[PDB]
């Protein structure tokens, strides 16, 4: 399945000592039915007012609550028993399924010598396990467990191992969690004055999240992975970790609409992030922000804590960006902030923006380019993964962003009722050009409008074959029907034979020298797979030269138009 579904149900913090394994902090304390189908009060009030505590209130409702001592019809001691394996089953992938619940985690155990890393609770603890419970379907079990382990669990466990080796952070977090549990359950009169076990657990978790930093990391991780977002977690107030599961919303070939559901608004383009992420020139392309620039700055300020050179460079690049100009022109934005070192920094920043769902890669937008409405345009559906519709919502958003322009139905009908021409035929005047290009960037960034690229293949008729036969001889018959051509399509002109290369070089016979040069330089790309926009960018040619070569060679060139 291409639809994103992070199948988390909760998180654990299972530590072990010489006295035996126990549990420290698990969240949420909800039941199986919901998940499957004094000064401390002032401090927690200030933390809730400032937004430092981000819990989910549906996890602590009366119908969505389970006891703190029970986790999915298992006791805390039971879970700490079967999630604390031996030394041979530690420091490796812990996969464990109980019917439909998979207990996936990477437990970290100290070695025999007593070091956490190869370069009270501070000395008794020999193992900790941040166990993640998933319930994927049996047809998607391997995919979900593999992506979760590769993208969240391994990174979080390795960072926790590093911070425990260098700082002994998890030991102190477990100590303060247990101290706050004792001080709420057995000392606080506010706990006894609160009615309902769910509200008691909500207040206890509020105190734990207020006093503990590892609890905040785990809570934010679960909340922002279950919501299919980027989870920025604060650990030890000195390092941050960003965790996500990547979303499949890019497709080159068109997916089957009514057999395999795909996110509405997916980018139906031949230029993809994943074609470039797997390679890790990209600087010949231009970026396209997925949100407002100030929102991207606010999201990227949570990617660090000290405002280092990388975040400053990335913020400067996001603030001064345009989707209509290539990334090779942005060397001046970082030359002032300090092949080439600036090109390497630009490439690394482009990978950072396009990997973390910030700035998608596009061909640089021009009014001369033909833009069609994508089949995957978010028109139907109440939300992105539904399966008032999204067209009216995005029309309201378009009216809010551009109040001096015609409505989103007018723009999406003007581009999909005639033959697909260049985008400059919608813009009335040159004064309307930047706001219309902003509207075009808004349409592309929402998956509404893709680009119609030109693909060229080479074709040879009977006259070229007869001329080549005459040239070969140099070194029926009673009638001449003109509607009985013997055509032939040379599929790959690079690996052509001697007679087929003669057919290609007899296709250009009487053309001038500039056409001969442009045909020779562009012969290897005439295979029906390379879009001519990339040929224009790479070969440093202009559009008038290409339209000259299309007009001068009409019956020999196959014209193929898709995204």
């Amino acid at each position: 399945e291409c639809l994103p579904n992070s199948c988390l149900l909760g998180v654990h913090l299972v530590i072990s000592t010489h006295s035996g394994p126990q549990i420290v902090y698990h969240y949420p304390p909800s039941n199986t039915a919901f998940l499957t189908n004094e000064e401390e009060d002032m401090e927690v009030s200030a933390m809730l007012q400032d937004g430092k505590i981000s819990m989910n209130e549906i996890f602590f409702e009366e119908e969505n609550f389970q006891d703190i001592n029970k986790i999915l019809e298992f006791d805390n001691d039971f879970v700490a028993e079967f999630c604390s394996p031996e030394r041979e089953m530690c420091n490796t992938r812990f996969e464990f399924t109980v019917d439909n619940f998979c207990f996936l985690g990477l437990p970290i155990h100290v070695d025999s010598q007593g070091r956490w890393r190869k370069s009270d609770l501070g000395k008794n603890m020999n193992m900790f396990h941040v166990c993640f419970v998933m319930n994927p379907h049996l047809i998607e079990y391997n995919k979900r467990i593999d992506d979760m382990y590769q993208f969240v669990v391994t990174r979080l466990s390795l960072l926790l191992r590093y911070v425990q080796s260098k700082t002994s952070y998890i030991s102190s977090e477990c100590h303060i969690i247990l101290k706050e549990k004792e001080r709420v359950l057995k000392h606080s009169k506010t706990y006894q004055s609160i009615r309902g076990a769910g509200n008691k657990g909500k207040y206890l978790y509020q105190r734990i999240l207020a006093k503990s930093s590892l609890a905040r990391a785990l809570t934010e991780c679960v909340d922002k992975i279950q919501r299919n977002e980027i989870a920025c977690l604060e650990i030890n107030d000195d390092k941050v970790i960003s965790l996500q599961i990547p979303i499949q919303n890019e497709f080159e070939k068109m997916p089957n609409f009514k057999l395999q559901p795909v996110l509405r608004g997916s980018y139906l383009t031949s230029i993809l992030n994943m074609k470039f992420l797997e390679k890790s020139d990209l600087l010949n392309y231009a970026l396209l922000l997925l949100d407002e620039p100030n929102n991207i700055i606010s999201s990227l300020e949570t990617f660090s804590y000290q405002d280092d050179i990388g975040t400053i460079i990335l913020k400067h690049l996001v603030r001064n960006i345009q989707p209509n100009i290539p990334l090779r022109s942005y060397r001046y934005l970082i030359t002032d902030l300090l092949n080439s070192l600036e090109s390497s920094i630009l490439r690394s920043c482009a990978l950072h923006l396009m990997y973390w769902r910030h700035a998608r890669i596009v061909i640089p937008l021009s009014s001369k380019y033909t833009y069609i409405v994508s089949p995957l345009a978010p028109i139907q559906g109440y939300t992105i993964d539904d399966y008032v519709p999204l067209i009216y919502q995005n029309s309201m958003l378009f009216r809010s962003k551009f109040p001096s322009l015609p409505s989103l139905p007018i723009f999406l009908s003007l581009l999909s009722t005639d033959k697909p021409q260049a985008y400059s035929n919608i813009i009335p005047s040159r004064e309307h050009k930047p706001v219309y290009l902003n509207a075009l960037a808004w349409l592309i960034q929402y998956g509404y409008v893709t680009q119609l690229l030109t693909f060229i293949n080479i074709r040879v008729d009977k006259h070229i074959k007869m001329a080549v036969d005459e040239d070969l001889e140099k070194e029926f018959e009673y009638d001449d029907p003109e509607m009985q051509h013997d055509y032939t399509i040379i599929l790959e002109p690079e690996r052509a034979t001697a007679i087929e290369k003669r057919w290609l070089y007899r296709c250009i016979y009487g053309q001038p020298s500039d056409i001969q040069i442009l045909f020779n330089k562009l012969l290897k790309y005439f295979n029906g797979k390379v879009p001519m926009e990339l040929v224009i960018i790479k070969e440093e040619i202009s559009r008038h030269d290409l339209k000259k070569l299309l007009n001068a060679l009409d019956k020999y060139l196959i014209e193929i138009h898709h995204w």
């Binding site: 009985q484 013997d486 055509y487 032939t488 399509i489 040379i490 599929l491 790959e492 690079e494 690996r495 052509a496 034979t497 001697a498 087929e500 290369k501 003669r502 070089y505 295979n527």
Partner: protein, 294 residues
């Protein structure tokens, strides 16, 4: 009738005499998966199931209930994983006057290995097999036609719609597994194809000893940095790679390649082939490494 079971017992039956009990009972230390009588002489051939060193055992059957042990004559050692079937390969004269037929054991195993085992005349004599005898009935004659080749046969106008050349890693990976137990042409071709992933093979035919490979070589007189697509067709003699029998190199007529450069490349290829066949070595990796690169 002979039988074999999981307990390690090979039982020989004669149901004309008695349905209960067995004429002979041979006990092994391993379970037996496939046990069969020999097609020649008086004997039988059993192979293990999960243990027994994964070797096919050949046991004579020439004697008078007899609970005995396994005393094989020949053990076909090899086959790192278990054998799951064994076959026999028989050839003889077409007309038939004397019974002089040879046999070859073919075994297939779980480690994806298909091995052919020769049978010596020591095995042919240890088993009571009368090699050369007047036939009571003539042996059947079978057609020796292969079947690996692909077979083929309003109206339609005669047309060449798409170029065939615009439409082979399976071949170059299959030839790596061929071992005639560099000592082979196909092994050399597969090793070079694994060595050079950029070189594209268009026609590999070890049986007809003809090769046709395509590559991108830096042999452009206009610009030294430009790479020219080249088609080189190579024909090997039946005495390759002995001395005095070099491979024949033919380069397809290319418009991008000048005739002087083509003659220089052909002369250098002939020089390299003659110099490496003078030492009775193999000349296809130095030639390819000369055409593209150094």
């Amino acid at each position: 009738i002979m039988s074999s079971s999981n307990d390690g017992t090979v039982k020989f039956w004669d149901y004309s005499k008695s349905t209960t009990e067995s004429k002979r009972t041979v006990t092994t230390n391993f379970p037996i998966w496939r046990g069969r009588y020999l097609p020649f002489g008086e004997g039988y051939c059993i192979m293990p199931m999960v243990g027994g060193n994964n070797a096919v055992y050949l046991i004579n059957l020439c004697d008078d209930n007899k609970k005995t042990k396994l005393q094989p004559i020949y053990a076909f050692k090899g086959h790192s994983d278990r054998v799951i079937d064994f076959l026999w390969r028989s050839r003889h004269t077409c007309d038939g006057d004397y019974d002089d037929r040879e046999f070859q054991l073919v075994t297939w195993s779980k480690d994806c290995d298909l091995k052919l085992w020769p049978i010596s005349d020591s095995i042919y004599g240890k088993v009571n097999f009368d090699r050369g005898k007047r036939l009571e009935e003539k042996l059947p004659d079978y057609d020796y036609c292969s079947y690996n080749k692909e077979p083929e046969n309003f109206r339609r106008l005669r047309e060449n719609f798409v170029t065939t050349s615009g439409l082979k890693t399976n071949h170059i990976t299959w030839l790596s597994g061929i071992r005639m137990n560099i000592q082979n042409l196909g092994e050399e071709v597969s090793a070079i194809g694994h060595k050079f992933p950029k070189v594209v093979f268009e026609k590999i035919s070890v049986s007809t000893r003809e090769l046709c490979l395509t590559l991108n070589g830096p042999w452009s007189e206009e610009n030294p940095d430009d790479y020219i697509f080249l088609r080189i067709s190579i024909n090997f003699p039946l005495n390759y790679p002995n001395k005095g029998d070099p491979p024949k190199f033919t380069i397809e007529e290319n418009s991008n390649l000048t005739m002087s450069k083509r003659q220089e490349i052909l002369s250098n290829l002939a020089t390299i082939g003659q110099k490496y066949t003078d030492s009775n070595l193999y000349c296809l990796e130095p030639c390819i490494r000369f055409v593209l690169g150094e």
